[PDB]
């Protein structure tokens, strides 16, 4: 029993973090095989960071300008490549702790674990949802760029996020491991705003299924809705529209509870319109939206064969 | 920026986690040097678990009865003994990944990270506080016993919790690494109840101070209270009574912010009675009590030298 936002175990990732210093700017890199991946603004001065021309800045850098440290071992940089907003530093040594891994680009409403690092050294780990406005509500201080987000499936680490920056509102923006930003953001110190965040509807529905399984079911009703009619109400209340892809991932919970997705949608719709009127769901007056259908099935209480 | 319930990186603990099987009963063990620590109820059949005489049940077990797997490597048990509620299985191979470590008994109110494991495979990591009633509100399913709780101090792992059971309320109970239960619980399937789960008042207050440093102080007011009249309200809401000693603990944060502890108490009193009115504090719509007075400032935003 018990619902907790858990991160995946971070060990396979810890053995890949290094420190990357380019002159008087430092951040973290990810060391896989003989390549170290890091945010390209490691080549900037603080002044450069206002309006960098990264191609012009990189021309002035040589392999010797990059100092890469794996604990107490210096790795010699033998080539470098800018790819979108990440730098790929080829080093003379393959990382012996390289896990089986892939790079994947995640979608809003999906979760991943963040390993926050400073100076190449892992600091803490926590679970994030990619918000519909393509920011994450992380915890990140100066020097944390190059920290990565990931999911783990058996032994295979799927890297999906590299941290780059913090917006004026205190939320966080980064790239996938190919170096393309999530969202409309750029790695310059300019006045950028993230769009209005919206509630991740599929995750609230998963939460509601979890509530039913644990016996909390006052909010169920006998009403019917089309998906388009439900989505019109969702958009009014700044909830994300439910897609067929969301309906697919709610399949197992629907099957195990016998509540069709569109019936649980009609139940949510009444919640949005009428509020919760002093009732609670799973012991809270607020609807959770960062437990995915996968999270819910993994942690939900289960039947007991007696 | 950002404020998150963060756990320590779990890599140093992942390398210690093994599966222990005795008959058809399996759970996790902690492999340090040539010893595996696990909950003693691995020797029970399910029917044994109701009212076990552990001494009698252990007498009928031999070394050969314990199967230990570290990944694909089988670890043969070459001695065994019981210590309170844990077993120490001596194995033929010292763990080459043993970190620097110690066993420590934490206090109610203190925090620790949990590496939840099943079949000796680490599954997830999250941060918990030892509740005033000596329970933990974690996410644990069948087969998670033997999962451990820990803090990391640079390179040294302080193991402080080993998981054993779930009470009828869904809350979790366990032991230190010498096998002594936190709280009055016993490792048998009986009708046990924990004491009242109170909110950790000193932790909420430290969090309010961290809020002020970050710039959330909409809850600050000009009112002040005495310790007694605060505790009147505290008991009404099942907050721990605030002692003068707790008041002393908050001295440093009080000096950091210029805010008298009893003035912060006045703000907390008003928040308890009137709620937050749709405002949040450090991104939370609830009063957070899982951050210790030392831990809270580490995530605060800092001054920027311009
Ligand atoms: Na600088």
Residue numbers in the entry:
A (entry chain B), B (entry chain A): 1 to 306
The authors write:
Analysis of the crystal packing with PISA27 shows the main interface between dimers ranges in surface area from 800 to 1000 Å2 with the ring assembly as a whole predicted to be stable.
The main protease of SARS-CoV-2 (Mpro, also referred to as 3-chymotrypsin-like protease or 3CLpro) is responsible for the majority of nsp processing, cleaving at 11 conserved sites along the polyprotein including self-excision of Mpro by autolytic cleavage of its own N-terminal and C-terminal autoprocessing sites. SARS-CoV-2 Mpro is a functional homodimer of two symmetrically disposed protomers that are each 306 residues in length (33.8 kDa). The active site of Mpro features a Cys145-His41 catalytic dyad, which orchestrates nucleophilic attack at the carbonyl carbon of the invariant P1 glutamine and the formation of an acyl enzyme intermediate central to efficient peptide cleavage.
